[PDB]
Amino acid sequence: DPKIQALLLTVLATLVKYTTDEFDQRILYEYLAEASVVFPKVFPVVHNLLDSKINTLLSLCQDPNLLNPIHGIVQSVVYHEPQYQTSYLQSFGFNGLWRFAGPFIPDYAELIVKFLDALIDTYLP
């Protein structure tokens, strides 16, 4: 299912976007290199997320182990350059996924107030 591929990819990309540990990044980007080659038609979804950090790691980095996956992803992307833009997550309701899982009220809280009040009113007599 392309939605499941897109969600999986977006989670891995989300984990790359934020995590500061280069050892985390090694593991994650190795999985993105395979995942790009595995799901090439869906991979464009993640490109916006990856773009900022991939520019950063290309221009800055000097670990070959982390770079080998990154260069693999760029190669894979160009080799298969779409059927699913970043907007695709929005259609099923996941545009916030990379939004929310970033670093640490009013609009959310009012909806939660209505939800909790409805939860009480349904469940509690």
Partner 1 sequence: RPVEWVQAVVSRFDEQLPIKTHTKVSTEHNKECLINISKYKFSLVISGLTTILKNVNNKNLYLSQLIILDTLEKCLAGQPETMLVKQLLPEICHFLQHAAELRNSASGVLFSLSCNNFNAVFSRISTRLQELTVVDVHDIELLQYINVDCAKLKRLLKETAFKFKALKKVAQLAVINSLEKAFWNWVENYPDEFTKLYQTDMAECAEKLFDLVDGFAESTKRKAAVWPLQIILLILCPEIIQDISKNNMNKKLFLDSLRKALAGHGGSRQLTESAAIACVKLCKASTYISVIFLLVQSMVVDLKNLLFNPSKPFSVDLMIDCLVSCFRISPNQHFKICLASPSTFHYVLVNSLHRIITNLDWWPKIDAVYCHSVELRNMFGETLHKAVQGDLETRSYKYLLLSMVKLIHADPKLLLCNPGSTAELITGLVQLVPQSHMPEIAQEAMEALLVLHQLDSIDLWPVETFWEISSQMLFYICKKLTSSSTEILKWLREILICRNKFLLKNPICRQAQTKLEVALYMFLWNPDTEAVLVAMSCFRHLCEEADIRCGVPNYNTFMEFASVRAALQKRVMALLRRIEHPTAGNTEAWEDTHAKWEQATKLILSLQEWINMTGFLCALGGVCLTPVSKFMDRLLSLMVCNHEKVGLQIRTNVKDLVGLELSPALYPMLFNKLKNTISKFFDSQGQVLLDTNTQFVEQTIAIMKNLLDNHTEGSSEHLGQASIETMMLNLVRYVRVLGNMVHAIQIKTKLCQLVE
The contact set with partner 1 (CB under 8 A) reads: 47-48, 51, 54-55, 58-59, 61-62, 64, 67-68, 71, 74-75, 77-79, 81
C-alpha count within 13 angstroms, C-beta hemisphere, residue 21: 6
How much is the CA Rg of the chain, to the nearest whole Å? 18
Nearer to partner 1, 38 or 61 (CB): 61
Query: Smallest distance, Å, CB 46 to partner 1?
Result: 10
How far apart are CB 123 and partner 1 at their closest, in Å?
Answer: 46
Q: At closest approach, how far in Å is the CB of 103 from partner 1?
A: 22
Q: Which residues contact 12 (CB under 8 A, 6 or more apart)?
A: 28, 31, 32, 35, 46
Residue closer to partner 1 (CB basis): 34 or 117? 34
Cα–Cα distance for residue pair 9/45, rounded to 1 Å:
8
- Taking the C-alpha atoms of residue 18 and residue 115, their distance in angstroms, rounded to an integer, is 30
Of 90 and 110, CB closest to partner 1: 90
Query: What is the closest distance, in whole angstroms, from the C-beta atom of residue 87 to partner 1 in the complex?
Result: 14
